[PDB]
Amino acid sequence: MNFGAFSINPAMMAAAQAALQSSWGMMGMLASQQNQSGPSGNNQNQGNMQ
């Protein structure tokens, strides 16, 4: 894959008698790729091009 910008920009602002609250499960980018073979296999080709 090819990206032009990949901009991730939060504005987090709370200025009065106020309360701001935030949580992220992995704010960003996960690029995962995985090969695994089962037992007693043969003649196997596994490839991941991202």
Partner 1 sequence: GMLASQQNQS
* Least spacing, CB of residue 21 vs partner 1, in Å: 6
Q: How far is the CB of 40 from a second copy (least distance, A)?
A: 5
- Evaluate whether 47 touches 35 at the Cβ level (below 8 Å): yes
> Residue 43 region, left (φ>0) first, then alpha (ψ -120 to 50), else beta?
left
Q: How many CA atoms lie within 13 A of 37 on its CB side?
A: 9
Each residue 1-40 as x (binds a second copy by CB under 8 A) or -, in order, gives xxxxxxxxxxxxxxxxxxxxxxxxxxxxxxxxxxxxxxxx
Number of residues in contact with a second copy, rule: CB under 8 A? 50
Using CB under 8 A as the binding rule, the residues of this chain from 12 to 41 that contact partner 1 are 19, 21-26
